Design a binder for these strands. Structure first.
Lengths: 116, 100, 65, 65, 49, 51, 88
RNA sequence: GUUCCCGGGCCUUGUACACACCGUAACAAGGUAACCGUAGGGGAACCUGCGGUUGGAUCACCUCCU
RNA sequence: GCUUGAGUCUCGUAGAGGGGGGUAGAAUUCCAGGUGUAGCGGUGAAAUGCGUAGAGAUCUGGAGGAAUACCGGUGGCGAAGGCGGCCCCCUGGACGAAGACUGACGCUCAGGUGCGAAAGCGUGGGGAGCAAACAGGAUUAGAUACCCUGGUAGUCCACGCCGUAAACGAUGUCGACUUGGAGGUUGUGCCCUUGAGGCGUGGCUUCCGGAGCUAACGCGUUAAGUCGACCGCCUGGGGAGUA
């Protein structure tokens, strides 16, 4: 639906969750896929193979729109970031450009309090 | 008296009515004891990031020997003139003329 | 080693930005001291020029916004 | 950051993402600030890296094996 | 003196002694493994050229 | 004497470059130290007047 | 800082030379006149925790400067304060 | 074939141990690094936030470029 | 009276130095609208909570608030504490080439004064993120502890009080003396700076060492080495750096 070819696929592998989502060039979201909804709850949420299945979940149920050249703009320096990319290339897509527009602050706000 | 490299940019739509703006400011320098070294004009060059709507501003340079107290009030003029959005004054002792 | 800070004595200007582009990358990043053999004098001079150019949109800050 | 390589590739090659920062910005904005801590491990690290240079200076004189 | 680019502008006398040394070690090897006479003498003619 | 009349560009070589300047070839560019200046020169003992 | 076109005036008056700014009758004057040019600093903003030490430095160097002039020649001492006015 | 496993041995690393490994708070990285200062709280050790210091440990592997 | 001490002037230099103010941009939270799914968060694992009153996520637009990635370098300034975007106003400290001068105007110092991270409190604004007290789910024999969902003081700005510290390269301060190399960082003089250099002169700082000292480790031109000067401190610990 809406007919889009260039699908901006924001893949955000944080630390223990990787979300893949193709949207419209404008901004109209198309379909999502997550390492937490496809299963793999655990240290598996922090694995690139789960990100490979995340790419597969973002490979089907999205052909209704039909994207070919997609702008895989990766966000958040996490576990995947390549296994997910080659999952999409082995899914039937042609990534026109892999961009690294990760959520980057100029050390704006303070970072969160976690891990020990 | 001191050297102030006043480099500023107006919008591409004001690039057609900026020469009048130039005669405004340079006339004030003559009325404030001053002399221009380089009225450097490149053209309307592409901005990296569009300012809230459009990119490609217009660059014009002065690089004038002028008194610090008049240029201070002159900077206030630039600050509340919405054509010139980004305008800064530079170091002293040496204002250049080459490289264009 | 470089021939920009040898034949380029006394403060490297930034009207024409092509020379700072030898010292920044196509991403918007500033080259480190250890690559091109350039003592801090020349290095920090470029630094002043760069900050100024990015405020005036001559040079970009990050890659994309 | 932004790699394309026209269309004959069948590969990602995010080698510039790593040549940019990748984990660079992350190292400071993933876990709390701690302000002074990183400074501490900077001194220890240098002591062992400069000693590596002293190591390169110790091997040049004999190493008769 | 190689040729600036990827070739050899060298005195190809080296390329000649090269074969001389190749075949030298060769007959000494034909002493170790003890090869038939008609062929080690064929190497005699070889190191001869 | 030995003045320059006209300049001649001329290919040089990867053989002529050091590993120190093979780092600066990945930064500055390809056609910087790839071609050298082997212009047309006036051999010693020749005078002249370009007309 | 003491601007240069105030300084050269003061030195040529008190001193015989234009470079005679090493004589105590001139050393103290340029120190006092430097604070007289610094008044514009400590009158406004008030919280200069760094320039505070600078004041204590130049003024203390002046308290002992006037100390030796006092012990060596009370005639030029009372003359320093009578030509500039740095007593009170 | 030494990566898995049982035992032995050499080198190295760390110890407030050598009397020799109600709650574990420190000493192995004590498996949540330690210590001082400030405020508050909790049966109790101390804990949380902030600044500083070395009277602190390993920088050993798994994947990519000549 | 004279100068190798202190210091001033003429000509210049770099910067997270301080006080007041303005501004640009990203991200987090929230609100409204377009789209759409059945999951989001987190942990060794689980769970309270959110959600079909369409959350999480994305785009556009907008109102607050704190802090400045890459540049970053046992790099820089400073008495110290402490402090990283840019600029304007005021302005301090440190240093150097070549000369002119008063002629030891120099140093430290109980009582005293000033600066004094963070935090607590009074007062006027304020709240995105995190977080004492507290509620809940559990690992557990128990949880007022590790973790997570919320959340007040606080974090921020200005005016004062408390005037406290590992305010510790634990090395008090000023001056003088003592074979070098690698560096980092900021100026200048001289020579073909013809080119990414060579030979000197000062400041700060790091590593390896000699003379020396020490219990050892090691510091080592910035000394724990050799002297002069001044102040404070110790005479076993606990009690107690407390009443």
């Amino acid at each position: 639906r809406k007919q889009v070819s260039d699908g901006v696929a924001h893949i955000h592998a944080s630390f223990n969750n990787t979300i893949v989502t193709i949207t419209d060039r404008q901004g109209n979201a198309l379909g999502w896929a997550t390492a937490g909804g496809s299963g793999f709850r655990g240290s598996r949420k922090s694995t690139p193979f789960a990100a490979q299945v995340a790419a597969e979940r973002c490979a089907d149920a999205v052909k209704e729109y039909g994207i070919k050249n997609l702008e895989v703009m990766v966000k958040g320096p996490g576990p995947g970031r390549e296994s997910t990319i080659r999952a999409l290339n082995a899914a039937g897509f042609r990534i026109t450009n892999i961009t690294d527009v990760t959520p980057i602050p100029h050390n704006g706000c303070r970072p969160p309090k976690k891990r020990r | 008296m001191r050297h102030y490299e006043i480099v500023f940019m107006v919008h591409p739509d004001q690039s057609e009515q900026v020469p009048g703006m130039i005669e405004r400011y340079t006339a004030a320098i003559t009325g404030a004891e001053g002399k221009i070294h380089r009225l450097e004009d490149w053209g309307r060059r592409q901005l990296a990031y569009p300012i809230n709507k459009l990119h490609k501003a217009h660059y014009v340079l002065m690089n004038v020997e002028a008194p610090q107290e008049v240029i201070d009030e002159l900077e206030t003029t630039f600050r509340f003139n919405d054509a010139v959005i980004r305008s800064m004054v530079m170091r002293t002792k040496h204002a250049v003329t080459e490289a264009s | 080693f470089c021939r920009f800070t040898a034949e380029g004595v006394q403060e490297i200007d930034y009207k024409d930005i092509a020379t700072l582009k030898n010292y920044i990358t196509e991403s918007g990043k500033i080259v480190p001291s250890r690559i091109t053999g350039t003592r801090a004098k020349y290095q920090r001079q470029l630094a002043r020029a760069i900050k100024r150019a990015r405020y005036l949109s001559l040079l970009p800050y990050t890659d994309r916004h | 950051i932004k790699v394309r390589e026209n269309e004959p590739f069948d590969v990602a090659l995010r080698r510039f993402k790593r040549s940019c920062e990748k984990a660079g910005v992350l190292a400071e904005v993933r876990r709390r600030e701690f302000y002074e801590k990183p400074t501490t491990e900077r001194k220890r690290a240098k002591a062992s890296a400069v000693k590596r240079h002293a190591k390169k200076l110790a091997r040049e004189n004999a190493r008769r094996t | 003196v190689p040729l600036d680019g990827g070739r050899f502008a060298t005195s190809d006398l080296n390329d000649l002694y090269r074969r001389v040394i190749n075949r030298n070690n060769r007959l000494k090897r034909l002493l170790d493994l003890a090869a038939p006479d008609i062929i080690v003498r064929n190497e005699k003619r070889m190191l001869q050229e | 004497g030995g003045d320059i009349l006209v300049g001649k560009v001329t290919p040089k070589g990867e053989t002529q470059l050091t590993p120190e300047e093979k780092l600066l070839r990945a930064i500055f560019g390809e056609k910087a130290s790839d071609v050298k200046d082997s212009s047309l020169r006036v051999p010693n003992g020749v005078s002249g007047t370009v007309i | 800082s003491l601007s240069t076109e105030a300084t050269a005036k003061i030195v040529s008056e008190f001193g015989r030379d234009a470079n005679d700014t090493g004589s105590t009758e001139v050393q103290v004057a340029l120190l006092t006149a430097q604070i007289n040019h610094l008044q514009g600093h400590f009158a406004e903003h008030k919280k200069d925790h760094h320039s505070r030490r600078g004041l204590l430095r130049m003024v203390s160097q002046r308290r002992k400067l006037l100390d030796y002039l006092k012990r060596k020649d009370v005639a030029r001492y009372t003359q320093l304060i009578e030509r500039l006015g740095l007593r009170r």
